[PDB]
Every structure is written in structure tokens, then in C-alpha cells.
Amino acid sequence: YGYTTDDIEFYWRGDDNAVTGVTKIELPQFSIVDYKLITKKVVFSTGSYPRLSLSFKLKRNIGYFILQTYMPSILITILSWVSFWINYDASAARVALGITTVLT
């Protein structure tokens, strides 16, 4: 915060092994794909300051969403198709199928 590059320097101790425990992290909705260590300098009106950056790549797991939103939608669409086999003279049944599926 207060010390510029004339007062303080930052570096990763190990420079690639400085961060441990990334492979031992279990997220319920995500998977860590990659992590990166960066060493740079930033500039504000008050001077230039050292900065380190630790970044993670997170890929989302889609199983929960297969079970939550996709499969109900596929099933409601197939339910909608069920009406094509009812005879076309039956109006109330086909209207019930169509209206229920559309509004759902």
C-alpha cells in the first residue's frame, strides 16, 4: 500500500512452487483447471508499486444443471409432442396439453 518499488520488492518464494494445495481443493460446482503466478508493477498517481497476482481457472460442472433445468425442459417438450397422437377432433385434450406445456 505505502511502499513503492524504491522501498519494497515482491517475489514468489519458489517462483512456481510458492502456491500449494490447489490440486487438493474440492469445489462442489467447479473444477480448477489451471492456476498462474504473475509478478508485475502497477502505477498510480502516487508512484509505482510491486504486485503479485494469483489467478485460478474455474470450469463449471454441468451435472446439477442437467438435473435442474435441462431435463425438465426436454421432458416438457416431449410431453408437448404427445398431443400429435391424439385425434384432432378432440379439442379439450389437445388444448390442455398445449396450454399446460406452453405456460409451464
Ligand X SMILES: *[C@@H]1O[C@H](CO)[C@@H](O[C@@H]2O[C@H](CO)[C@@H](O[C@@H]3O[C@H](CO)[C@@H](O)[C@H](O)[C@@H]3O)[C@H](O)[C@H]2NC(C)=O)[C@H](O)[C@H]1NC(C)=O
Q: Please enumerate, by residue number, every residue annotated as part of a binding site for 4-aminobutanoate.
A: 1, 46
DSSP 84: G
Q: State which of residues 11, 18, 34, 73 lies at the interface with ligand X (CB under 6 A).
A: 34
User: What H or E segment, with its residue span, contains residue 64?
Assistant: helix 63-65
Q: What share of the chain is helix, strand, coil (3-state, %, to 5)?
A: 35, 30, 40
- Does position 92 interact with another protein (CB under 8 A)? The reply is yes
Which residues of the chain form contacts with another protein (CB under 8 A)? 28-29, 61-64, 67-68, 72, 75-76, 79, 82, 85-87, 90, 92-93, 96-97, 100, 104
